Amino acid sequence: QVVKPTDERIIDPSTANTQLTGGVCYNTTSGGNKPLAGSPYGYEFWIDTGGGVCSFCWYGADQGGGAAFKATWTNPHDFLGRLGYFWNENKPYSHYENIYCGFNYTRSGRKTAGDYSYIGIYGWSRNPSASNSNERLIEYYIVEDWFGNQWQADTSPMGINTTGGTVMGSFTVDGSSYQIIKNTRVNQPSIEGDKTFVQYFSIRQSPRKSGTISITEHFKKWEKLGMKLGDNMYECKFLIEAGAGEGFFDARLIQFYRADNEGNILQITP
C-alpha cells in the first residue's frame, strides 16, 4: 500500500506562486542531457531543424523546489525544454520507488505554442527483451496541460487527433481522470536514431497549472494495460513542448521527490 508523503520539506503547490528571478539561461541546443551544478537534476534543450530564438532558464538549486525553470520561444520548430531526473543506468521504473512532482507555473495563453503542445512529465525507457520490436523503445508523457490551438481550447484535454494512436484505457489520480493512449511512431527520430518506437500518454482530463503528479501511479497503470516500460528507464523530467507559436512557460515551483510505500522520503530538493 502506497501512502502519500507528508514530509515538511514538500512544498504545497497550491500557494507556491511567487515569481522567481535570477535564472541562468541557455539559448541553444544542449546536445542531450546536461547536469546542473549543485543539483541532482539534468536539463535538456532540444529543437527540430530550426527557426530558433528559444531560451531555457533554470531558477537554481535553492528556490522553486530546485527544478523550476522558465522557457520562451519565437516561432520554434518543435521546441522541447525539460528538467528533472536523468537515469539511463539499466534500471526499471520500480527501482526509483514512488516518484512525485509538485508544480506551479504560469504560461502564455491559448494558441501561443502552435497546433500541438505538451506540459507535464516526460521521458524514455528501453525494453530490449520485448517480443514486439516496435515496443523496445518507449517515449512517454503525463500531460497536465497544453496551449490548445485554433480548433480546441487549452481548457479542453487533447485527444488522439493530436497524439495519434489508440485509447487503451483510463484511471483517476491526483483529482482527475486520465485518458491513456498508445501510439506507434513509424521511422521517426528518437534517442536511438530514426526508427519505429511507441509512445505512452496519460492525458489529464481536467487540465491544470499547479498540483502534484503521482508519476509512479501512471507507470503502474500503463504496465497493467500491457504498455510495458522495460528495464532501462532513461529519464523522468518536467517538460514544456511547443510545436510552434510565440510564448512562455514560467515555473514558480517544480519539486521532484521519491518515497517508499510507507511515504518516507528517499530523495528531495532542495
Side-chain angles (χ1 to χ4, degrees):
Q1 288 292 355
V2 185
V3 174
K4 300 300 205 60
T6 50
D7 184 298
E8 70 178 323
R9 295 168 288 173
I10 297 167
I11 298 155
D12 190 341
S14 64
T15 51
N17 46 33
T18 307
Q19 178 64 53
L20 304 175
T21 59
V24 178
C25 305
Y26 299 91
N27 288 61
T28 69
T29 301
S30 62
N33 172 254
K34 286 284 142 65
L36 292 165
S39 171
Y41 309 121
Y43 83 100
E44 181 165 354
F45 178 132
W46 193 94
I47 33 166
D48 219 323
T49 54
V53 206
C54 303
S55 67
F56 180 93
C57 312
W58 177 48
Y59 284 125
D62 305 322
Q63 68 180 352
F69 65 85
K70 180 207 208 297
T72 68
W73 54 94
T74 312
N75 206 340
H77 297 89
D78 198 14
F79 163 78
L80 283 81
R82 66 191 193 264
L83 200 158
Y85 295 127
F86 188 78
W87 289 324
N88 197 31
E89 61 184 356
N90 295 272
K91 299 296 178 171
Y93 80 83
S94 55
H95 175 80
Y96 306 97
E97 292 280 1
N98 304 103
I99 312 157
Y100 305 87
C101 180
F103 70 99
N104 189 303
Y105 64 83
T106 57
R107 55 162 174 89
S108 50
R110 187 172 164 187
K111 213 180 62 49
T112 54
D115 299 313
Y116 65 95
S117 58
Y118 303 91
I119 305 171
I121 293 284
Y122 172 95
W124 295 75
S125 193
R126 302 181 223 250
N127 190 11
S129 81
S131 48
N132 190 323
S133 66
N134 296 348
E135 305 178 350
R136 297 184 183 145
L137 185 62
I138 307 90
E139 185 176 32
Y140 73 82
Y141 291 79
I142 302 157
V143 182
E144 298 295 285
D145 195 13
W146 73 317
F147 293 77
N149 60 26
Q150 192 179 342
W151 320 112
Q152 185 176 189
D154 62 325
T155 57
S156 171
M158 70 176 66
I160 61 168
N161 70 322
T162 298
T163 63
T166 304
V167 174
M168 298 299 287
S170 78
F171 75 123
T172 293
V173 69
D174 305 311
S176 179
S177 179
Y178 284 78
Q179 184 166 82
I180 299 167
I181 292 162
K182 174 180 177 183
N183 182 53
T184 304
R185 300 276 285 157
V186 181
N187 303 142
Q188 290 295 330
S190 69
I191 62 164
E192 306 191 330
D194 274 44
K195 67 162 58 183
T196 298
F197 63 96
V198 285
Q199 301 180 301
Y200 302 167
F201 298 87
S202 288
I203 307 304
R204 195 176 172 91
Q205 298 304 101
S206 307
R208 69 183 173 164
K209 302 182 184 57
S210 72
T212 302
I213 306 167
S214 299
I215 292 161
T216 301
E217 295 302 304
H218 291 275
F219 296 161
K220 286 192 285 180
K221 289 289 183 280
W222 298 341
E223 291 227 327
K224 286 147 168 150
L225 298 169
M227 297 159 57
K228 302 306 196 185
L229 296 159
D231 58 357
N232 188 10
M233 290 285 292
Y234 184 69
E235 76 193 312
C236 183
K237 301 198 171 174
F238 204 96
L239 171 73
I240 171 71
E241 183 176 359
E246 179 169 10
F248 75 90
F249 166 90
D250 194 353
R252 291 86 166 96
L253 179 69
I254 305 180
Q255 186 179 43
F256 287 90
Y257 51 97
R258 311 189 293 102
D260 62 26
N261 294 357
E262 307 82 19
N264 299 310
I265 298 287
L266 297 165
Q267 188 177 22
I268 192 158
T269 57

